[PDB]
Design a protein around this nucleic acid. Structure first.
Ligand code: ZN
Ligand code: ZN
Ligand code: ZN
Lengths: 401, 130
RNA sequence: GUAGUUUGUACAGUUUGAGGGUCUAUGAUACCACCAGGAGAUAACUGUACAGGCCAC
């Protein structure tokens, strides 16, 4: 009797979880695998599921994180080594404010080249570059302002051809088929890409938000630089290939600082708005950045919200880096929530009605759609979690010369 | 085919080095009385795989003349069948049974019986009777 | 809330590559013996869903 129960518990050791009373549609199944998130018919199905090939991927995939999770916390020498590594990443080839001077002048050169024959237009630096929330080899986000007596896809015809006859740059992709039609360029001084978008005001507002946070908090730049670089080496930052957007990585690390108690950034909505309700959070729509320490808001009444605290970081950067990797490898349950840095408590998928079997992330000035829908394949999802696993494996591992 | 056939019974057979001896009841289709000794070797054996005989099973063969007992050119079982080998596609991990596998043996699962002491505690490869 | 349209992915049976210390090796009496604790690895047909996803309501 009970020996058969202990042997089906030996099946449960390989992640088969039984039920006794079930939903009428779930009457078909006595078991479930929480790794595969798929209901399982019976004890024979459990015997099947211990052989089942996705579960074998799921078993090893789940067992992998326990190693890195057990890998040791940094010693003071290890802390110094981690800090030295991330600052030399940030400085030697990462885009600091000093390198941002070069990238801003590159954006100015793009403006010069394009507005040589589109003088009414104007090109605006924004995105991960301008924030200093950057990476070593990066693409500058450039935004065309244009008079609205013309169509921006039509205007991109007048944008592309100069670059298609340019003498300064390489990598001129005719990237009209992107969701925002752009023309791409590679500056050859920095050796790095450039992307010429237009009219993306909400991205520029989030850019000013993150730049204000970096003005308040220094670690901001170094930490995200590091994270982005890592994701790139790990090819997670390519949103077209089932990955996560870099903008979304920036908001991800902002959420990390927003939740790593004591949180080194302050949240945008709360009790200082007297009579605020998080259950009608959408009504409290934010507006433009004020003084690079505040963000505005307005509804149909309006005001501003603080982006600062009374003291900056006084904790070692390597500790911040290791716990930043620990946050989005082991702490933030990627599939259960939206990365929602509008609110201290995490906003769920069904709170914005989005599906669940991937990460969800929101734009700060547009909570309309998930900007993390690119993960859909569970194989690519397991690959991304495996890259995060390799991150928290190596960077928790001590070294030898 | 040859005229040099024969038949009889196995005297003995080593599996590992692959030779033995036979005692023959027939020679070239002619019956014999008393039986004669005739060799068997794995280079002479017709079977595939690890060619071996049960040490006493019935056989058929072909021969040629030899001093240390007759030498076989070919050896088979009776009627040309494959020889057995010394008589002593895997054990079902639900029950230990060779004849079935996982979905072939869908009975409710069992804990680890140590086969050396016949108790459900551990594994026979860790039991010190080895 | 329920469909017609196929994908990887579990898939259920079939057909399956190894049958798994497989491998092995002394030409005239020595083999067998003596270390397993692990739900058994791909391509094809077929039965359903996951969820990506086509045409609708
Ligand atoms: Zn499973
Ligand atoms: Zn069996
Ligand atoms: Zn024992």
């Amino acid at each position: 009797r009970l020996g058969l129960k202990q042997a089906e518990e030996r099946l449960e050791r390989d992640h088969i979880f039984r039920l006794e009373k079930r939903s009428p549609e779930y009457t078909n199944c006595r078991y479930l695998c929480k790794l595969c998130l798929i209901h399982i018919e019976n004890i024979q199905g459990a015997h099947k599921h211990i052989k089942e090939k996705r579960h074998k991927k799921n078993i090893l995939e789940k067992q992998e994180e326990s190693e890195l999770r057990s890998l040791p916390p940094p010693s003071p020498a290890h802390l110094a080594a981690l800090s030295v590594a991330v600052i030399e990443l940030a400085k030697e080839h990462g885009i600091t404010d000093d390198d941002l001077r070069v990238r801003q002048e590159i954006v100015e050169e793009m403006s010069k080249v394009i507005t040589t024959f589109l003088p009414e237009c104007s090109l605006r630096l924004y995105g991960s570059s301008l924030t200093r929330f950057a990476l070593k080899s990066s693409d500058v986000n450039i935004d065309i302002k244009f008079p609205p007596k013309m169509n921006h896809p039509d205007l991109l015809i007048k944008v592309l051809g100069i670059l298609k006859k340019n003498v300064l740059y390489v990598d001129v992709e005719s990237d009209f088929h992107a969701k925002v039609p752009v023309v791409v360029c590679r500056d050859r001084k920095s050796g790095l890409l450039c992307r010429v978008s237009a009219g993306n005001d909400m991205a520029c507002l989030t850019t000013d938000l993150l730049t204000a946070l970096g003005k308040i908090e220094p670690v901001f730049i170094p930490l995200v630089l590091a994270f982005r670089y890592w994701a790139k080496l790990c090819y997670i930052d390519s949103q077209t290939d089932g990955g996560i957007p870099s903008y979304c990585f920036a908001l991800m690390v902002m959420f990390f600082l927003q939740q790593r108690k004591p949180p080194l950034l302050p949240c945008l909505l709360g009790s200082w708005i007297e009579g605020f309700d998080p259950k009608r959070m959408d009504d409290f729509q934010l507006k433009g950045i004020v003084e690079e320490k505040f963000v505005k808001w307005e509804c149909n009444k309006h005001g501003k919200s603080p982006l600062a605290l009374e003291t900056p970081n006084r904790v070692s950067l390597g500790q911040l880096w290791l716990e930043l990797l620990k946050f989005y490898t082991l702490d933030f349950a990627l599939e259960e929530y939206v990365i929602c840095v509008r609110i201290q408590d995490i906003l769920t998928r069904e709170n914005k009605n989005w599906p669940k079997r991937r990460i969800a992330i929101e734009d700060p000035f547009s909570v309309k759609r998930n900007v993390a829908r690119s993960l859909n394949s569970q194989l690519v999802y397991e690959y991304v979690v495996e890259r995060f696993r390799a991150a928290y494996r190596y960077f928790a591992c001590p070294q030898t010369k | 085919p040859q005229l040099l056939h024969g038949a009889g019974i196995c005297k003995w057979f080593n599996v590992r080095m692959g030779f033995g001896f036979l005692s023959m009841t027939a020679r070239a289709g002619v019956a014999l009385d008393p039986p004669v000794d005739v060799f068997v070797h794995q280079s002479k054996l017709h079977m595939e795989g690890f060619r071996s005989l049960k040490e006493g099973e019935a056989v058929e063969f072909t021969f040629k003349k030899s001093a240390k007992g007759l030498e076989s050119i070919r050896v088979t079982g009776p009627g040309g069948v494959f020889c057995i080998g010394s008589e002593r596609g895997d054990r079902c991990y639900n029950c230990g049974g060779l004849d079935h596998h996982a979905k072939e043996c869908k009975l409710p699962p069992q804990p680890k019986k140590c086969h050396f002491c016949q108790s459900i505690s551990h594994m026979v490869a860790s039991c010190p009777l080895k």
